[PDB]
Structure 1
Amino acid sequence: NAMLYPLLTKTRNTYDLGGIWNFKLGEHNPNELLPSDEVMVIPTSFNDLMVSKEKRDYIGDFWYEKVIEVPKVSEDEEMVLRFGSVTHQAKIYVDGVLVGEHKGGFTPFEVLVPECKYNNEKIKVSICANNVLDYTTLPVGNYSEIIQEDGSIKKKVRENFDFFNYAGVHRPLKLMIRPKNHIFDITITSRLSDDLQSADLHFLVETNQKVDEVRISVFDEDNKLVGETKDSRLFLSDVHLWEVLNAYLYTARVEIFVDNQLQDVYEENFGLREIEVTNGQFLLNRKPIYFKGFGKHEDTFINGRGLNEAANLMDLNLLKDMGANSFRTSHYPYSEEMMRLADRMGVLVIDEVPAVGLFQNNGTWNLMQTKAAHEQAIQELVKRDKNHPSVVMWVVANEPASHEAGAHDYFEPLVKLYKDLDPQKRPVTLVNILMATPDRDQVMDLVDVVCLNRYYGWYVDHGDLTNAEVGIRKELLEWQDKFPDKPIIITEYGADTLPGLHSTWNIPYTEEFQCDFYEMSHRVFDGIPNLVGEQVWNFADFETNLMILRVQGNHKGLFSRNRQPKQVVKEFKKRWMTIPHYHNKKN
């Protein structure tokens, strides 16, 4: 119900509630006043702000509480609390009274403030956040409890994924004043003409009550009116297409009227671009695209998984400079701010739900109770991002046990849910793990694009690039042979590389070996006609939990965690600026 990005309009007052909140790790009664003994920032992960390991490793309920002054609310208006996200679970309280809940730490949700408080001077907002992950949540965790022999139970979450379980309120919290009779949702679809000069637009505006008129004004990038409609349909000539690294955005100003007066107004951006997957190719605007980019992470020093718009722009500027053109929201939906940035900069985005960890240590599909959370995640993501021209593909899961029995039955309705909910019917994919090699895999028949995470030379044939090349070329041909019409994209491939580590003997973990690894990989990729994309793992080093294979987090980044480059960055820029975005390898 809150998939529309929060705006300041003539009918919508949007206030930011970010800043210092009273904080507590542990139990709390929302009817009681949380003291200011401990405080916390919104938005940010709380973890790296804790000095001790004990508090940084906390699992369970943790509270945010602050008294907010009530703004003027008219009779025909309603006041809601719009969360960008709360990680992972949340129960929201107003004056000690439960007013909303949400499960899933990477999707936005709104909560209605009771009308009986609109004339009060202040309201106390309490946020009960929860970072527990188990077999019912996305992402998947291994939950356990141990008795401290002190009388209390201590919770632990052994992650089923390769990234640190950062938690907290990671995205902006807004106090929204909006009309009771308001615009609920906007869907924008287009059919491009045969000459790509015209477009048949369709605006599906959802309301909660009914209005006499639904007016839509369309403006270009010069803020010039180019179209008007009251019947949810509009034809437009002299269109400017949204292009890769050359974006063009229109704005649809939607106005609803009752008795000839404005009830609510909203502005939704959109881009004109065509997507089609056919004949082992990914077509953008009817031209073959070669994906060049990164698997990423919402990860930065200090803030952790918290929003940092400066980081987004810095990352995307580096992406553009290297000659790259895309990235994947691994392994969870990123902030709306990032998606809007990608729209504005013309960066292709592979959108992904938090479906990572669907893998036992078998009998995975008798153990995974994630169906409910998986369906909601797909519902929320599509509803939130369906209008983004940057979003070009959906991901049902990252490295699930797609070789075990019951896998095909699990994913078929989920792939279908993507196809049913997305009005653009964009391609959906499943990110494949090495254990699910062509013969054993039983799910890749459901998707439109084959996405592979392969580490020949790092995990398999470690430090053995000679035999790694034989192995990767062998399997890529197997995939291409099993699905002759499906395009292939490498979504993950890389090697842990610590800055400063050097050698003349192609030694793993050194900067030179990272260069050698990618050079070999690309030699193989360029020989596969159906391979239409390469996305490295990762853009930058990121935090993980404690595992012997992890040398203080993950170091497969091309850049360090401070966005400083490694040796391999210079090499990628040469390759990526040589290969055009529109690149046909069928010739």
Structure 2
Amino acid sequence: NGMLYPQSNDSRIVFPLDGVWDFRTAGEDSYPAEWADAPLPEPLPMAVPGSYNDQNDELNLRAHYGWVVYQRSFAVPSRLVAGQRMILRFDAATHAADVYLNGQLLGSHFGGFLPFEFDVTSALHAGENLLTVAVDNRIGSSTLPVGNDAGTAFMGSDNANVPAVAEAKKHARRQNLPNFDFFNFAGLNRHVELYTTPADAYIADIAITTERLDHIAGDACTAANALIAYDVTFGGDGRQVRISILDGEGTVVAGVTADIERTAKASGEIAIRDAKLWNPGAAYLYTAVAELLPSRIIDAYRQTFGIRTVEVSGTTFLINGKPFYFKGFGKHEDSYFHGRGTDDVLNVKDVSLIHWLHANSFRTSHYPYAESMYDLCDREGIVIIDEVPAVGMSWLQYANPLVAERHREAIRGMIARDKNHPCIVMWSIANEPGLDGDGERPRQAYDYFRPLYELAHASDPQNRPVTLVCCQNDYTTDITERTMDVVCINRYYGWYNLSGDLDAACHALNIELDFWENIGKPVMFTEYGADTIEGIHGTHGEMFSEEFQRDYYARINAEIDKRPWFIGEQLWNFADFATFQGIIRVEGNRKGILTRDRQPKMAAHWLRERWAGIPDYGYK
């Protein structure tokens, strides 16, 4: 279950397989299996980690449907592999993959945004090894994210009443038809690596939790005493594990020796005096060092953690007992050449932009991000809402057992990967599923999501609040959203409805706010905004102008400032990003307050000035 990021130390080594691989496109529903047996014929170059779609302008890889095949060779010294457990890890392959090593099928995986690995100890040999990876980009009615098995893409224009259109449609080239508003970037989007552990016994998983804080300082910089718990899982085979707690300076401030009891497991609690707490805008990280004992050490792992509590109380969101207010946006892993490919330079920059904006948070819309970004936010004091790729869902999916299982696969997987990050304060189990309507549809939606709500709570040792991001719907017939720990709403009053009329938009908003006032749950925006082309200006700003985008946030935020139970504003979006082409997408989605190149539109400056005057704690 544990999927600790591969680590190098005295017991373990990591061998990265990133770089420029060989690459071929294949078929709509197949690929040549014999390609795993020998070097790819006439291969293209393809850098990895990265989406393949924008790495070859001779081809139209954005239009590709079906399989592609990656391949490379590598060689490692025999003295490294001797007596070690050898693991091949894929941080992400989007969306599905078959993996071959030296002609042997290692296995397969579905889920484009969570890591998977294989024990390759017996599959490796000396000299050059041949690694072949087939990647499938197809989406449909049983995938997460959800595709349409027929019809149009989201927000799609159609003239079905024309006979000629209906006929041409039946013979059109097959394409992925997303039920979501971001381009279907595919391939080896994140790192690939080989790593080693000891074979006889090894650390397989670690969970650290903040159980209780005693006497938190007025500024919440410290607690007189903090009780943390550990749970270490072992694989392999009077054994013990040593656990050392390191402060920010590397000074061991606590240490205990725990018994391993059989799924070998060691667990217990540790008290930390005058513990330094993790807060938004004021991060502090400790290291839990686990060392498996035989002065020699058998195995070791260093796990970063932060000491903080998260608790919903009434209409407040408490971090270290203080009333928090979210300032931020939904993001995307999206950039030009890389597509959805992970880029830590850009991740480092984006975190700096978040500070520049005086935001304090974001949501991983609409999929778990690369692991390195969570590490980055841990040390930079940025709060995260962590979200599974359950986007584009409706009643057709709720009746499908395969979807329910893939959805459970996403939640346990996300939480298994991300549980130790202090920056994560809440889980999101879906973005904009169908929740409303008449007859049995509301109850059907409820019955699908409630056990996923329970699963998220049961899976997280820290027991963080769980939410579901609600689309702009009939909130009076939706019976699911109001049962979440925090009500997270996506609203586009004045853009997709009452278009351009900000008075009417605010009037409509206030009517729904009057509704949520009575539900008595904490409420925040997770999306709102307006497409904006930088350089379009007006004295009286109309839709798509920079001025209108500024006016939009100015009018809307003035209304939510009047509601004490409204605990956060996360807009849409951080930056412009790529989408499937269509009549409402001007080179993608232009609702970013920054351009795709991370340059600030007028609204960004206005939001920066606003957020500078709003404290992380005690605003409401």
- Who is 1:312 aligned against? 347
The one-letter code of the counterpart of 2:379 is R
Query: 3-state SS of the aligned residue for 2:148?
Result: strand
The one-letter code of the counterpart of 2:226 is A
Matched, 1:475 2:489: no
- Who is 2:18 aligned against? 18
8 Å CA contact 1:144–1:155 kept in 2: the answer is no
Measured after TM superposition, the shift of residue 19 of structure 1 is 0.7
Matched, 1:252 2:272: no
Measured after TM superposition, the shift of residue 584 of structure 1 is 3.9
- Who is 2:597 aligned against? 562
- Who is 1:192 aligned against? 212
Partners of 1:67 and 1:580 in 2: CA distance: 53
The one-letter code of the counterpart of 1:81 is L
Matched, 1:209 2:228: no
Partners of 2:595 and 2:173 in 1: CA distance: 34
- Who is 1:239 aligned against? 275
Matched, 1:169 2:180: no
Measured after TM superposition, the shift of residue 197 of structure 1 is 1.7
8 Å CA contact 1:100–1:112 kept in 2: the answer is no
Partners of 1:368 and 1:473 in 2: CA distance: 39
Partners of 1:369 and 1:470 in 2: CA distance: 42
Deviations 1:386-428 (A, max 9, x none): 0100000000100000113410110011001101010011000
8 Å CA contact 1:358–1:368 kept in 2: the answer is no
Matched, 1:386 2:423: no
The one-letter code of the counterpart of 1:224 is T
Residue number among 464, 467, 471 corresponding to 1:426 in the alignment: 464
Partners of 2:53 and 2:601 in 1: CA distance: 27
Measured after TM superposition, the shift of residue 310 of structure 1 is 1.1
Partners of 2:203 and 2:347 in 1: CA distance: 29
8 Å CA contact 2:52–2:61 kept in 1: the answer is no
Query: 3-state SS of the aligned residue for 1:547?
Result: coil
- Who is 1:79 aligned against? 86
Measured after TM superposition, the shift of residue 78 of structure 1 is 1.3
- Who is 1:551 aligned against? 586
The one-letter code of the counterpart of 1:398 is N
- Who is 1:540 aligned against? 575
Deviations 1:252-311 (A, max 9, x none): 1101123x7422111000000111001101011101011001110000111010011111
The one-letter code of the counterpart of 1:383 is A
Query: 3-state SS of the aligned residue for 2:537?
Result: coil
Partners of 1:462 and 1:407 in 2: CA distance: 30
Aligned pairs for 1:513-528 (under 5 A) are 513-528=548-563
8 Å CA contact 1:469–1:524 kept in 2: the answer is yes
Deviations 1:532-575 (A, max 9, x none): 00001000000000121111100000000000110111111111
Deviations 1:32-74 (A, max 9, x none): 3203531211011111123256432111110111111133345
- Who is 2:96 aligned against? 89
Query: 3-state SS of the aligned residue for 1:157?
Result: coil
Residue number among 411, 415, 439 corresponding to 2:449 in the alignment: 411
Aligned pairs for 1:435-514 (under 5 A) are 435=473, 437-481=474-518, 483-484=519-520, 486-514=521-549
Query: 3-state SS of the aligned residue for 1:66?
Result: strand
- Who is 2:117 aligned against? 110
Which stretch shows the higher mean deviation, 209-218 or 324-333? 209-218
Partners of 2:173 and 2:58 in 1: CA distance: 16
8 Å CA contact 1:2–1:110 kept in 2: the answer is no
Residue number among 242, 245, 252 corresponding to 1:225 in the alignment: 252
Measured after TM superposition, the shift of residue 473 of structure 1 is 1.0
Partners of 2:86 and 2:375 in 1: CA distance: 25
Measured after TM superposition, the shift of residue 211 of structure 1 is 6.9
Partners of 2:73 and 2:111 in 1: CA distance: 26
- Who is 2:160 aligned against? none
Measured after TM superposition, the shift of residue 116 of structure 1 is 5.2
Measured after TM superposition, the shift of residue 144 of structure 1 is 5.5
Residue number among 191, 202, 205 corresponding to 1:182 in the alignment: 202
Partners of 1:427 and 1:311 in 2: CA distance: 29
TM-score normalised by L of structure 2: 0.90
Partners of 2:298 and 2:506 in 1: CA distance: 63
The count of residues paired between Structure 1 and Structure 2 equals 574
The one-letter code of the counterpart of 1:67 is S
8 Å CA contact 2:104–2:123 kept in 1: the answer is no
- Paired-residue identity, %: 41
Partners of 1:90 and 1:334 in 2: CA distance: 18
Query: 3-state SS of the aligned residue for 2:175?
Result: strand
8 Å CA contact 1:2–1:82 kept in 2: the answer is no
8 Å CA contact 1:296–1:327 kept in 2: the answer is yes
Q: Structure 1 residue runs of 4+, over 4 Å off?
A: none
Aligned pairs for 1:316-335 (under 5 A) are 316-335=351-370
The one-letter code of the counterpart of 1:35 is P
Query: 3-state SS of the aligned residue for 1:237?
Result: strand
TM-score normalised by L of structure 1: 0.95
Measured after TM superposition, the shift of residue 367 of structure 1 is 5.9
Aligned pairs for 1:45-84 (under 5 A) are 45-51=51-57, 54-72=60-78, 73-84=80-91
Cα pair distance change 1:579/1:117, threshold 3 Å:
closer
Q: What residue ranges of structure 1 are gaps of 5+ in the alignment?
A: none
Partners of 2:583 and 2:333 in 1: CA distance: 23
8 Å CA contact 2:532–2:592 kept in 1: the answer is yes
The one-letter code of the counterpart of 1:162 is D
Cα pair distance change 1:82/1:505, threshold 3 Å:
same
